[PDB]
Structures are given as structure tokens and as C-alpha cells.
Design a protein around this ligand. Sequence first.
Ligand code: NA
Lengths: 94, 16
Amino acid sequence: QIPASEQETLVRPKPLLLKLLKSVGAQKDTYTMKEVLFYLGQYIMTKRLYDAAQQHIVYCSNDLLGDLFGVPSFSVKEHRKIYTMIYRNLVVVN
Amino acid sequence: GLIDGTEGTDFESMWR
Ligand code: NA
């Protein structure tokens, strides 16, 4: 749901999100908004944090993601909430 | 879905 004119926008992750991106094989200091979203998804998928029956539910209270996002869990259906949680851990270039 | 608006019910389609 990122507009096309914003998918390539460069962003500078803060340390805690930078740690998370690195754990799934990222090696950059600077990312596009779309890359940040993909790697976050791969981190959730590689750690199997989503509920197997109701796959929009992500459990993260025992995980680095929950300290980063500041919630014990969240629903992927809540897009505006997730963007706010990501933008809190980013620095967008203007 | 978070990236480009893709629809679906599995985690991957919902995250996309
Ligand atoms: Na939620």
C-alpha cells in the first residue's frame, strides 16, 4: 500500500531495526521503503512468528520485534498501525 | 499487501 512514487524513497533505519534487518542477511545502512518491508516480512516468516491458523496474527512478545514495535502482538490487517510502528524506527530522506 | 496492495489470507499475501 506504499504509493509507487514512495516505494523507492530512501530511509535510514535506527539501530534496533538495523539489527533486525541484518539478521535476515541484509548488509546495507540505507534502504528503500519497499526493501524494509520485504525484510521485515522475511524475518517474520523465517522466525515463524505468525499464527498458523489465523495468519494475520503475529506474536512477538518474546522477540526483538515486540521491543522494536512496542506491542506484544499485532494484526497484519492493521496497515496504518504497522506503518506508524515502522516510521518510528526509520528516518525518511526528504 | 503492506507493500503494493496485494490481497489474500495467507501471511505472505497479507504482508505483501
Ligand atoms: Na493489532
